[PDB]
Design a protein around this ligand. Structure first.
Ligand SMILES: c1nc(N2CCNCC2)c2cc[nH]c2n1
Length: 342
C-alpha cells in the first residue's frame, strides 16, 4: 500500500550514504598502541579477533587482526580489502559498526563494536534449538539486513549462526564481511561454509545475490531444528545432498515453516523466494512472517525473546577460551604493495 513508497525512499537515501562513503573511505584512523590487549575472542587461519580497550575513552572493542603474509598465502587479498571497504561504507541496525581500521608492518587491523552476548551458534548448541517465534525474530533481522545489502548490490555470502552475535538488547549484530562483495550480476568465487552453500555455487557456473536467500533457509532450519538441513561427516557428501535438494523436516516444524523453507531452499533459482518479481516481499508476506511487525524490528522496539547474561564490561563468559598468542610487529614492512589501499 502506502508504506511501500516510504521504504524505497529510505533505501534510496541509504544508497546515497553508501556511495558517498564507498567513494571517500576512512583510512588508518587509529594505531595499535592506543589499544590495550585483554583477551582473544576468536582465532583463524590468517587472523584472529580480540577484546581490546581504547585508552582515551575507556571503550571496549573487538579488534580483528589479519596477518598480511597469511592473507596473501591463501589468496584473500581482494576479500580482505572488500571487508574493510564494505564495513566502513555500510550503516544498518543489525550490522556491526567498524569504528577504526589501520595498518602496520606485518598486520591489518579492524576495530569494531564489541558485542558481549557471544555467538548465536553457542547459544543454539547450549539450548539445543530455538522455538519458532524465537527463530522468526532472528530471521526477520536477517531478511531486513539482506534487503538493505542487496539493494546496495552487496552479496554477503557467509551467513551462519557463528557470524551472528547477540547484543545486550537481544538483537543480532552481523560481523565478518570476509566473503562479502559488491557485485551487479554474476560472481564466481567458491566460498562459504559447506552447510550454507546454495547449489548454484557448487555447480561453479557463476551465481548471484540469490545465494543469500538460500542461506537464510539454511539458517531458519538450523535455528528451528538445532542442526542444519544438509549434514554429513565430510563436506563433499554435504555438497551432493544440496544439489539433489532433498530435505527432511522434523515433525515439530510448522507447515507454515516448511512451506517457507521449501520456497527458500529451492534448487531452481527461478522459483526461489527473494529472486522473483516481488523479490524480498514474498518472504515478508509469507504466512510464517504474518505475526512479524517489520517496522518494529527495524526500530528495535520488539521485546527480545532472549537477552543474554552480563556480569560486567570487558567480560567474555559468552565466549570460548583460546591460547593467547603474541602480536608480532615486524621492523620490515611486509606486503605494502598488495595492501596499499587498506
Ligand atoms: C520496512 N521499513 C523500514 N523503515 C522505513 C522507514 N520507517 C522505519 C524503517 C525499512 C528499512 C529497511 N527495511 C525496511 N522495512
Amino acid at each position: 500500500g502506502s508504506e511501500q513508497e516510504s521504504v524505497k525512499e529510505f533505501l534510496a537515501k541509504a544508497k546515497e550514504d553508501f556511495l558517498k562513503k564507498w567513494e571517500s573511505p576512512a583510512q588508518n584512523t587509529a594505531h595499535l598502541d592506543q589499544f590495550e590487549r585483554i583477551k582473544t575472542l576468536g582465532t583463524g587461519s590468517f587472523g584472529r579477533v580480540m577484546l581490546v580497550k581504547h585508552k582515551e575513552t575507556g571503550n571496549h572493542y573487538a579488534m580483528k587482526i589479519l596477518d598480511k603474509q597469511k592473507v596473501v598465502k591463501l589468496k584473500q587479498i581482494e576479500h580482505t580489502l572488500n571487508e574493510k571497504r564494505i564495513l566502513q561504507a555500510v550503516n544498518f541496525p543489525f550490522l556491526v559498526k567498524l569504528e577504526f581500521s589501520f595498518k602496520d608492518n606485518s598486520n591489518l587491523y579492524m576495530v569494531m563494536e564489541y558485542v558481549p552476548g557471544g555467538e548465536m551458534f553457542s547459544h543454539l548448541r547450549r539450548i539445543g534449538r530455538f522455538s519458532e517465534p524465537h527463530a522468526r525474530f532472528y530471521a526477520a533481522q536477517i531478511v531486513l539486513t539482506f534487503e538493505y545489502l542487496h539493494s546496495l548490490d552487496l552479496i554477503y555470502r557467509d551467513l551462519k549462526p557463528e557470524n551472528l552475535l547477540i547484543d545486550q538488547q537481544g538483537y543480532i549484530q552481523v560481523t565478518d564481511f570476509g566473503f562479502a562483495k559488491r557485485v551487479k550480476g554474476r560472481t564466481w568465487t567458491l566460498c562459504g561454509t559447506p552447510e550454507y552453500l546454495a547449489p548454484e555455487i557448487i555447480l561453479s557456473k557463476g551465481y548471484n545475490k540469490a545465494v543469500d536467500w538460500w542461506a537464510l533457509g539454511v539458517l531458519i532450519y538450523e535455528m528451528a531444528a538445532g542442526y542444519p538441513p544438509f549434514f554429513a561427516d565430510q563436506p563433499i557428501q554435504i555438497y551432493e545432498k544440496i544439489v539433489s535438494g532433498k530435505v527432511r523436516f522434523p515433525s515439530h516444524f510448522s507447515s507454515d515453516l516448511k512451506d517457507l523453507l521449501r520456497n527458500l531452499l529451492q534448487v531452481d533459482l527461478t522459483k526461489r523466494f527473494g529472486n522473483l518479481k516481488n523479490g524480498v516481499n514474498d518472504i515478508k508476506n509469507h504466512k510464517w512472517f504474518a505475526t512479524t511487525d517489520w517496522i518494529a524490528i527495524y526500530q528495535r522496539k520488539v521485546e527480545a525473546p532472549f537477552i543474554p547474561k552480563f556480569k560486567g564490561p570487558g567480560d567474555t563468559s559468552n565466549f570460548d577460551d583460546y591460547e593467547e598468542e603474541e602480536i608480532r610487529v615486524s621492523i620490515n614492512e611486509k606486503c605494502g604493495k598488495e595492501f596499499s589501499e587498506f
